[PDB]
Amino acid sequence: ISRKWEKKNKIVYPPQLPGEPRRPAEIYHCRRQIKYSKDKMWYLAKMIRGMSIDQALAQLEFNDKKGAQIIKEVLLEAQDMAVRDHNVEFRSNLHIAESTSGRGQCLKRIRYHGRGRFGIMEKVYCHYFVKLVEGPPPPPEVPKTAVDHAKDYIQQLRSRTIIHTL
Amino acid sequence: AAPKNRRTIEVNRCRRRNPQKLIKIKNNIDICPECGHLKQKHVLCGYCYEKVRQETTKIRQQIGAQEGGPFRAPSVETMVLYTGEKPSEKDQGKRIVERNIKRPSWFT
Amino acid sequence: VYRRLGLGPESRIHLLRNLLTGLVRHERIEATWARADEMRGYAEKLIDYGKLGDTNERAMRMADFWLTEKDLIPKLFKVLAPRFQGQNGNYTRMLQIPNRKEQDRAKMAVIEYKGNYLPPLPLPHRDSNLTLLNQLLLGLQQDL
RNA sequence: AACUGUCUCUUAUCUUUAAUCAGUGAAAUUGACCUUUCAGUGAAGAGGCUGAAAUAUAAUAAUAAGACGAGAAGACCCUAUGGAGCUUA
RNA sequence: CACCAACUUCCUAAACUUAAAUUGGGUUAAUCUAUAACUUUAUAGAUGCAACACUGUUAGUAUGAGUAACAAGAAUUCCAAUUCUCCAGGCAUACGCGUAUAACAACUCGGAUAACCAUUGUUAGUUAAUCAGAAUAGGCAAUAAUCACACUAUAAAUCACCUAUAACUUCUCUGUUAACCCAACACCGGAAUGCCUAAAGGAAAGAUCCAAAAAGAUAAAAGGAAAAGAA
Ligand SMILES: [Zn+2]
């Protein structure tokens, strides 16, 4: 087993100089053993990526999946330690920078059948990894306009270089 | 039924990451002034509703003890009175339930 | 016009009979939203039977069958019926409650008899007229 | 022979299934695949060759009539100046 | 009235002629020994010394697939709480099992999913003079039962007690729990006997929707094989 996500939370940066900008806080929190499928947890993780702390909590509160309840507890724990240990002044000033799920060690059993058949029973466990960055979520992407696309095409034509000639 | 060959993770990754299969966000979340907790616009607050049910259970418990037997539902109206409030003439001809607690602020 | 409930038509009425009996005894019942809506019509019509009169022989047969506990029969004609004499309808108040966290996520609702002695339910409140938008609408109303 | 929804000739309701939510979780299978249509070529024979044609990406939902469908050492019968075994007085 | 096109050919640098069993010759990865080297090497001597392929063997992890698949009567005043709706083989002993018993504490594993425990840990338990299990030698015996009488029958069906000898005052030991056993299972069936048929024993509903198709059941305007009778 590897527990390097916690070690990422143990990273200590060098003292910042007075003429150095305040470093945004980064919090690494994970739940190593969850009796849940990582794929199902990943779906929850994918949606919440990049959202604010408050928005994620509100969405989770009205979610019907068991994994969502687990994430909310994990999210609440991460927020508590972030203020307690990572010097997060404002509770609201937190957003989900990263959210992903990993496989966990399972259990092996045989599934009996009533009529002499048998099956492979497996008890699934998973890991859940989240990194929280202090501050509001980054602004969303803006689609390219027609003007932007057209300009690039002309630039590409100009950028073309002649091939295999003097 | 199995495909004639193993399904590649690349193929599988695209299927599960298609937007149709992803979890959707909800924008109907609302705040409950009464409890100060979250609620849905079409759903009532449960923190305050929990108080009503808990008081109802306490009121029901008092009624059960007063009746003292099964199938003893009165044929007369019922009323609930709290400490500091005494039965009045208007309460005559109505079953009176006495509560040791004082009249709750929310309950009128 | 009817929800397909119960192992058979009798079960729905018997289940409705069980639901109706409990509501009369307690006057406020929490159940799945679909059941509460289905039984709301029966409860309102039962109150009309109480209004019809205690002497009504047909009402007794309906009341006797629907209410398994017979102590409620005097209550309906002497408590529920007198209570709702002024009212012309809407005797039952049904509201949606958050779904049960019992791993099945059933839709929940609470149905109660109006005029009951139980504490008032936390009903929704419309916006006050003192709000800026309402105050602006008030000015338009005054001019007209 | 009658009888009846067996049928002429189907319809309706109830139950199961069905569909949605949540929890749990197998099996045969699997060279790799960025996995199209038409004509040709070939061993009855082409998603992958030749030449034409079509073609945002990703998904989602339905049906088994025909190709006298594809097939095996399935099924069936008969043969041998074939073998070998067996019985002998 | 030409051009294109092969390493055919020419040209600069080079090179010196075109299938496959079989046959001659030169190297080499790795490990160890002898003797050296000293960021991983040399000369000799050795070998369990190199695997995409033996119906090869072991372990890990995928695919099918989060697919097949699976589950608890209602309300409340509450899981050793009440009441309501509905179901109808129950209780003892034998055999077997062997603590699965009960209380408490846990909520991970086990229940073919949970709740709840039958799982996990701790402690307790099943009380017997009555229930159950754990001297000798001789002599001498015709006639079934069937309410045994009548009555017949064939299929043929009953130690004792006498005579002697010997002993000479006793209640311990063991079984006793349970929803239990044999079927790989909390199996669907297998499992001896007595009593009795609800007073005993129980719950078909994880939720929502009311798709189609499919399965079972009920109903049919007019008709009646496109009632149970004959050959
Ligand atoms: Zn509130």
UniProtKB/Swiss-Prot annotation, chain A:
GO BP: mitochondrial translation
Localization annotation: Mitochondrion
Assigned keywords, A-Z: Mitochondrion, Ribonucleoprotein, Ribosomal protein, Transit peptide
A GO-annotated cellular component: mitochondrion
Main localization of the protein described in the UniProt heading: mitochondrion
Lineage top rank: taxon: Eukaryota
Gene Ontology molecular function: any one: structural constituent of ribosome
Family as reported in the entry's similarity comment: Belongs to the universal ribosomal protein uL22 family.
Complexes and interactors: Component of the mitochondrial ribosome large subunit (39S) which comprises a 16S rRNA and about 50 distinct proteins.
Protein name stated in the entry: Large ribosomal subunit protein uL22m
Species, as recorded: Mus musculus
Lineage: Eukaryota, Metazoa, Chordata, Craniata, Vertebrata
From Swiss-Prot, chain B:
Family statement drawn from the similarity comment of this UniProt entry: Belongs to the bacterial ribosomal protein bL32 family.
Residues that bind Zn(2+): C32, C35, C45, C48
Post-translational modification as stated in the protein's UniProt record: MRPL32 precursor is processed by the m-AAA protease (composed of AFG3L2 and SPG7), which cleaves the N-terminal transit peptide. Cleavage by the m-AAA protease takes place prior to assembly into the large subunit, an essential step for mitochondrial ribosome (mitoribosome) assembly. Proper processing by the m-AAA protease is dependent on the zinc-binding region within the tightly folded C-terminal domain of MRPL32: zinc-dependent folding halts degradation initiated from the N-terminus and triggers the release of mature MRPL32.
Record's protein name: Large ribosomal subunit protein bL32m
Domain of life: Eukaryota
Record GO cellular component, one term: mitochondrial inner membrane
Protein's GO biological process: mitochondrial translation; translation
Gene name, Swiss-Prot/TrEMBL: Mrpl32
Subcellular location(s) of the protein: Mitochondrion
Single GO MF descriptor: metal ion binding
Keywords attached to this entry: Metal-binding, Mitochondrion, Ribonucleoprotein, Ribosomal protein, Transit peptide, Zinc
Swiss-Prot record, chain C:
Major subcellular site: mitochondrion
GO MF term list: protein domain specific binding; structural constituent of ribosome
GO BP annotations, alphabetical order: mitochondrial genome maintenance; mitochondrial translation; translation
Entry keywords, A to Z: Mitochondrion, Ribonucleoprotein, Ribosomal protein, Transit peptide
Compartments reported by the entry: Mitochondrion
A GO term from the CC aspect: mitochondrial large ribosomal subunit
Subunit structure, interactors included: Component of the mitochondrial ribosome large subunit (39S) which comprises a 16S rRNA and about 50 distinct proteins.
Family in the record: Belongs to the bacterial ribosomal protein bL17 family.
Name under which the protein is recorded: Large ribosomal subunit protein bL17m
Lineage start: Eukaryota, Metazoa, Chordata, Craniata, Vertebrata
Gene name of the encoded protein: Mrpl17
